[PDB]
Amino acid sequence: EELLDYRNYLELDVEVNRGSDGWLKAESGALSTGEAIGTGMSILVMVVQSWEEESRRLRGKDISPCRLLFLDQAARLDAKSIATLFELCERLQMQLIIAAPENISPEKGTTYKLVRKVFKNHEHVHVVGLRGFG
Amino acid sequence: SSKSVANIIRKTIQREQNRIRMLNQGLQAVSFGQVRGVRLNVNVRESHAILLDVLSEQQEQHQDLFNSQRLTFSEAMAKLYQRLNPQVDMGQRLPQTIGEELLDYRNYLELDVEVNRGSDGWLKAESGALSTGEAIGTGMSILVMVVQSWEEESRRLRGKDISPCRLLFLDQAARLDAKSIATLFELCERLQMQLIIAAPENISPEKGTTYKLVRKVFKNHEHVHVVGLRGFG
Amino acid sequence: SSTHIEQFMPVKLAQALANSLFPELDSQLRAGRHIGIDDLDNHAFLMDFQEQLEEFYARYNVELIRAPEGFFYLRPRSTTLIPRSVLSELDMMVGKILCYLYLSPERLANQGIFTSQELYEELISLADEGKLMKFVNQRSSGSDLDKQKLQEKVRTTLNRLRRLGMVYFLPNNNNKFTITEAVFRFGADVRSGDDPREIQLRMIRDGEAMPV
Amino acid sequence: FMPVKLAQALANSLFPELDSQLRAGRHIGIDDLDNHAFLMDFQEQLEEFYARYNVELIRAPEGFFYLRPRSTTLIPRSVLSELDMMVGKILCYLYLSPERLANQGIFTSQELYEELISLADEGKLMKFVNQRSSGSDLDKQKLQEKVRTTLNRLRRLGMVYFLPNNNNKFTITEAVFRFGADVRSGDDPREIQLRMIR
Amino acid sequence: ELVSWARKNDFSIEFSTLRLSMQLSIVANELHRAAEAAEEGGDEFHWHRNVFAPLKYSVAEIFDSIDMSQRLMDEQQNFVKEDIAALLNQDWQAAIANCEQLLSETSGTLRELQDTLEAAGDKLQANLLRIQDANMGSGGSELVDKLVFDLQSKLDRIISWGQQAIDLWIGYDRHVHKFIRTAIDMDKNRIFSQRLRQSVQHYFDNPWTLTVANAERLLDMRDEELALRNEEVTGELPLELEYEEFSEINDQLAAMIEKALLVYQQEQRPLDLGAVLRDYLAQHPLPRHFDVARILVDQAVRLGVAEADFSGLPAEWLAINDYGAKVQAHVIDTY
Amino acid sequence: ISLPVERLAFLMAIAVLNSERLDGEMSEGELIDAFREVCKGFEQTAESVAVRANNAINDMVRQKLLNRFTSELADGNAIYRLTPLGISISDYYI
Amino acid sequence: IERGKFRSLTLVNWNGFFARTFDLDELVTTLSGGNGAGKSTTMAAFVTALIPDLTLLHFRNTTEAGATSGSRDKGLHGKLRAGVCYSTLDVINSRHQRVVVGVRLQQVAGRDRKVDIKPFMIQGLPTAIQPTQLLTENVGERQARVLPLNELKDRLDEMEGVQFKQFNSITDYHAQMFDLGVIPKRLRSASDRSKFYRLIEASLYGGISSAITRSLRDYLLPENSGVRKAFQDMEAALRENRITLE
Amino acid sequence: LIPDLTLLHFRNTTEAGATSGSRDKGLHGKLRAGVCYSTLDVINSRHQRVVVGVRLQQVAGRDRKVDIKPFMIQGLPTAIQPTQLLTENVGERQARVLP
DNA sequence: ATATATATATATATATATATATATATATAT
DNA sequence: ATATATATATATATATATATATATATATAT
Ligand SMILES: Nc1ncnc2c1ncn2[C@@H]1O[C@H](COP(=O)(O)OP(=O)(O)OP(=O)(O)O)[C@@H](O)[C@H]1O
Ligand SMILES: [Mg+2]
Ligand SMILES: [Mg+2]
């Protein structure tokens, strides 16, 4: 039954062009946290692209599915990695929701300051928003 | 013999309960996220208190179970645990392993971590119901408790003149906000514990020492350049 | 009918050979290990299928033999398909001493647990000290270096006997051991009340004991 | 119960000798017609029988059968010396194509000795005999005796068939391929064998 | 630590149960008297003379005496073991009754000692817990607690041995029977033993060796020898560490904004983030605007909450400057 | 009765541990550790640690200083207890 | 009492680091740098110097912390360069003794990414000698070289007062490190070592380790042998009763 | 987006792939007593304003369980926000969430 | 005196069987 | 015309047994 599936005839790997070395197999243990996060996001955007291309033949010709992805604890990435992520997502028309404990301050997009409090003996998240900077 | 076993188990359980409860007062209200404190909850388990009572008083009534050639001693203990107290509903694990577990006194104490989250009282600390920074703070508190316990337990073997070194790590310390990191620093300074933390940003600019590492590709190899950082200039 | 076990093998022999204990027990036996009452599982397994296993091992030209004391072992024949070997003379001496300690009531306080030091003390008590040392080294005359050498040789022979099942080291201690009834074989030359030179001939004929 | 065909294999009068030789590590090749045919017929069951011993009954690509002990082997295991492996690889090399014109399948101890001296490095030879040795008569005599001993040990394994006489002249079987290296497309067997040995 | 103390010191060189009962009775009486005196209470001198001089010395001495009696029982145990061993050497089959008897008396004595120990262990423990309860009547009674913690273990310890010894003896006993059932049953006349002894003495006059199966070991292929990586690495050695300093500009800005904003909290004036941000950002160049806005918001949200946030009516995105900057926040009313 | 400095220190350590021991029993597994510690403190290596420990324990047992009981389950398969003479000699100084 | 302290951590010939000594802090040392800077490598070096067991050392990403990725590689081999590598911790004891513990690491040649570690300890080294220099030889014009264990032993033995020990087992290494107040617990058994590594690994990845919180009993409460002996006694009694019944 | 209770498991960021440890999926505590809503607002390529969402409710009982009912709204005017449909502006200080 | 072989124990990852809880379609009482 | 109970499929994750690799002790032999 496995043999009857053409995909099983194909070998798939993820490769990264790391530093002065050539293309290496992408091993989670042989990469830093930021590099692994970037590689994962790249693979995810590829998967989304693949699904949209697969389903385009079964949709109206003028339907472009919405694209969105998350990134929790984005503070694990430095400024350059975050800039690369934003450039990559803008190129692909993909939306991003990133959660940062105030460590990073990306100037482009919308930002929401959250502050937990107690009001009327109930927990309340005071939320303020900014956008348009840059 | 069964009576003696039950009595020794009870004595050891009481001693450990008292030790842990006395130790609990060694924490001073860490402020991690909404978590305002961390505590250890040690209590003799009733599902095992019943078993201890049976072993101490009513060994002869269940002899149909102990002297069955099919069941080993561990399996016999597991089956007796099943017999009385039948609402526990243990899972797929075999009788042999759940009996070998019963042969250990520590399993007779429920030993949980409670956190004083906000204003809801002391709740069992489960990762599924805690922020990431709150869980990091709680975990580090538990780790320092473990280290303190180990050091105390070795106070006899060691010489009177040596106090062991203390050190712990924190990778991706950027997941903690300023308040949590300050709390960690003060808690460690109180406990004479060293910390080595890593973060892409200078998350602690005014405490301890700080280095900045920059990796440079250089003639087809990689070299790291390290420069210290100072609080003020 | 065909596709039926009785065609090739007896049912009980097949059951014995299919038992979970058979492979380890067989490897140990072929290695030369004697089986005593202490190995409750293995001893009972041998007892249940003694005849089936005996006829199985007969195919190798080796006799699975149960001494009257109740311990099983293997005696290869001259045409053995499984190689054969003879204990060293020092091994015979130490085995005789171990049997003596098994039968000695003076050591009753030990409760069967003995240390190599006690074994060596008994050995020197019953044997000829310097003339026993002669085998350890041809040029010994009471030198303490040769004394330690003899102690080490006795320790090595004790380990070898442990490998043969004649002795068990304690579950946590390798410096203490408990004797087993297998040691009785070291007295097979004297269990019968006859002339030693005739009993020796009987044994060597039976394959029990080659000479040196 | 027991598998029926397994019982048939165990009952066969060939089983005792073959079992002893397998548990002794001997390799059964195509030369042993009866034993090889027995293993061919009953492999599907003898593999399970010897897996009960935490050992694997392996049929090599060349065809010869053998037993590979696992870490949890119930059969007392043992390991060949370094000189043993060197001599095994030497014999594998001598299983050559030029071999047909060189010795016609019959070699002598002198061939192996000269090949070992010329081919191996001096440091490994000394490690075999002893480190402090240096090109001496006693050391070389001891080395030759150890070579003979390892040749006998290999004979026990079936790698080398002695020609029947006290004199040391033998033939090399295909099972020796165990010491050999893997073969790639277009690789010269001599070159790869020597690269492995070096 | 005592090893150095010993090194510098330079030094070198009644089993009757009626007794045990009478010491136990004396201990019970004295312990009850001391416990009652402690419970009644008194000053520091009374506490001392009633719970530290009488209790401490008496209980320590008599518990040591009871332990000494147990040690004497252990000595008798050893001696009876030796006597049985010596007797079996002289009579062999005819000493079986003697050895069984001796085992009987020793077992009975051990059981009686255990019975006498447990005859008063419980009450003594109760009195000791009572003294624990009464100890807290004064702050200087710390030492008393130690005894109330020490005299516990000893007592219990004593009782423990009273069973452990039997646990040991009931073991030894069995072995002896086993010996008679195994060693002497097949050597009733002992002839096998003497003949084995003479064979050992005269073994080498007819040296013979037994035969054992010696199946071959399964020779295996040696794993490849492991060779490390050697390259004689060389490289430039690092210079002295340089240093860099952190900019506190943001600290100055935050302090400025905090001072400018505290007036709103002081006066409880309704704070509107839109207007405040629009006014305040005019004081800085455009590139810095973001770094101001964030900080300002951080300072404003600590000051009370906005009551409108519970109305379910979303707020608008008010522009706070040119170039297209916007803010979404309700007026902060509840300080 | 013959207690060199090392034997005396080992006996005193045994007495101290027995005083601080919970139930007043000493398996040889702890006696060997105590002898190891005393010998390390005295800084002398005539033979191996194990042989010295065994010889000293046997000498004290035969010198009426310790009593031995064979219990297989106990750590070291033996349980040792101070004898009245040993108690007296130890507490004379302690 | 004055608790001992880690003065510094030295990496010689690691991935990126040729010979770098970080002077740790009495309370807190911070490492900063963009992604791929080499902070996790520094902590890997420290942990390897502390617990050199190769059954334990497993440097998973901070992501998938404890999640089986099927990589088959522990991640230690890639962090070292070809040649001889060192990882040493300098510790000032409670007794004011400067002891330099450490390991010599070195890749094993071949396809499998396997590493070889040999611990060692140095006592009595003068306070004026830096471990960065002690492990390197100044060969060339300011072009120091890394020297192996044998050369290091020769260099140290030629000094006066320094005691260099090399350990044939990790157990002896940990015993010596505990005797000198570098570890809280005595890691006599392999399980003790596993628990120590679990604690440091939990700290490294931060927060509630599943392995720890699932065995807080094994980590906090001590083992007791009296209960086990009592259970063995009851087991023996039950065995005898069963024998009689049968 | 995915109102399936088999898959929804809001474990902690640390322990991102680790086993459950506990049995709670982490969603019950994030809700409050009453009727909760989680609604996305979407503008298609065809420029239709579609308001997708789910209604959540703590299932009262012994355990910590949740009930999710998906729903979709189409054709809403652009001048009405999702927080205006689901809350009645009663005269009190705080609005009322309607089922 | 020390290299080397051997047996044992532990940690770690793989693979399979199985019980639990949820989602979906149909049946049947309300 | 409806909502609850059933049967089915599925993913989750729980536990066991296996096999591998590493560390250790230690017993042999030169
Ligand atoms: N085992 C390995 N094999 C190969 N390269 C590795 C290995 N481990 C780390 N690296 C590389 O070393 C460099 C430093 O990685 P490292 O894990 O030290 O980063 P880091 O300081 O933790 O960074 P981040 O902040 O992104 O977590 C990166 O290029 C990483 O790819
Ligand atoms: Mg979070
Ligand atoms: Mg990292």
Side-chain angles (χ1 to χ4, degrees), chain F residues 14-89:
Chain F
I14 291 163
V16 163
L17 199 159
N18 177 46
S19 59
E20 294 294 328
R21 167 61 80 230
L22 299 165
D23 295 15
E25 73 283 17
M26 181 146 297
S27 75
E28 73 164 11
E30 278 63 359
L31 271 167
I32 64 165
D33 291 331
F35 184 85
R36 174 187 289 171
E37 294 294 328
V38 65
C39 81
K40 168 164 59 42
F42 267 126
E43 301 295 40
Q44 284 299 309
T45 307
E47 309 94 10
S48 68
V49 168
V51 70
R52 292 174 278 156
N54 203 249
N55 306 0
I57 297 169
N58 300 339
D59 282 330
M60 294 192 238
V61 165
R62 63 148 276 274
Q63 282 181 100
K64 317 302 294 207
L65 287 161
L66 270 75
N67 289 81
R68 155 169 49 236
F69 308 122
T70 285
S71 169
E72 51 274 29
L73 310 177
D75 196 54
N77 320 108
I79 283 153
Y80 286 74
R81 266 164 72 75
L82 280 174
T83 188
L85 286 77
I87 297 295
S88 312
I89 298 314

Side-chain angles (χ1 to χ4, degrees), chain B residues 80-126:
Chain B
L80 163 56
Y81 184 58
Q82 309 256 21
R83 180 85 69 69
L84 54 87
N85 169 245
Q87 295 289 66
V88 288
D89 195 359
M90 51 215 78
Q92 203 174 340
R93 54 211 311 261
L94 289 171
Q96 172 65 25
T97 73
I98 190 167
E100 279 178 347
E101 191 208 76
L102 271 155
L103 268 44
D104 178 354
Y105 69 92
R106 294 173 298 201
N107 288 101
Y108 296 65
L109 304 157
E110 84 190 26
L111 163 55
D112 284 320
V113 184
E114 311 194 310
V115 290
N116 181 16
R117 219 200 75 69
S119 58
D120 295 332
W122 300 81
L123 301 165
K124 169 156 180 162
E126 55 187 10

Side-chain angles (χ1 to χ4, degrees), chain A residues 72-73, chain B residues 130-133, chain H residues 12-13:
Chain A
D72 215 344
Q73 303 300 0
Chain B
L130 276 176
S131 163
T132 295
Chain H
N12 215 341
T13 305

Side-chain angles (χ1 to χ4, degrees), chain A residues 107 129-134, chain E residues 253 256-257 260-261 272-298 318-328:
Chain A
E107 184 163 45
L130 309 161
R131 76 185 198 191
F133 286 90
Chain E
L253 185 57
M256 185 180 288
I257 292 147
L261 272 158
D272 176 40
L273 272 170
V276 177
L277 270 157
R278 179 141 46 74
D279 283 348
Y280 204 110
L281 283 183
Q283 317 301 314
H284 307 73
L286 175 64
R288 180 139 285 282
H289 278 188
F290 189 49
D291 298 296
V292 184
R294 284 196 312 95
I295 292 166
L296 197 147
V297 175
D298 291 331
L318 275 53
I320 53 160
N321 77 348
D322 311 333
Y323 320 113
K326 303 214 176 208
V327 188
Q328 194 187 262

Side-chain angles (χ1 to χ4, degrees), chain E residues 143-154:
Chain E
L143 305 181
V144 175
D145 205 352
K146 292 197 290 186
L147 297 167
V148 179
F149 193 80
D150 289 343
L151 277 292
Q152 293 291 322
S153 309
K154 318 314 165 273

